[PDB]
């Protein structure tokens, strides 16, 4: 055994750079802006980023933890 989890860390960047209409698109889809890899030059997260975050979040890697499968 003696198995451990890689771990988790945080990087500066409290204030997010993205339009207001887009900032909400996340709060509605429970999307972590910070996680949403912005596209705009200045890492500005555009509306497209959101639609691109779900397509990736939906097909994530997760265990069976039961009969359920999706």
Q: Could you give the angle at the alpha carbon of 11 between the alpha carbons of 29 and 28, nearest 5°? A: 10
**In this structure, are residues 41 and 31 in contact, taking their beta carbons and an 8 Å threshold?**
no
Alpha-carbon distance 22 to 18, whole Å? 7
Counting Cβ atoms within 10 Å, is residue 63 exposed (0-12), middle (13-18) or buried (19+)?
A: exposed
Residues 6+ apart with CB under 8 A from 34: 13, 16
Query: Number of structural domains, the chain?
Result: 1
**In this structure, are residues 54 and 29 in contact, taking their beta carbons and an 8 Å threshold?**
yes
Span between the terminal Cα atoms of the chain, in Å: 29
Domain span at residue 40 reads 1-70
């Amino acid at each position: 055994g003696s198995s451990g989890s890689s771990g988790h860390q945080e990087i500066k960047g409290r204030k997010t750079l993205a339009t207001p209409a887009v900032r909400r698109l996340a709060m509605e889809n429970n999307i972590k802006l910070s996680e949403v890899v912005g596209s705009g030059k200045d890492g500005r997260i555009l509306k497209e980023d959101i639609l691109n975050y779900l397509e990736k979040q939906t097909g994530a890697i997760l265990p069976p933890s039961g009969p359920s499968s999706g």
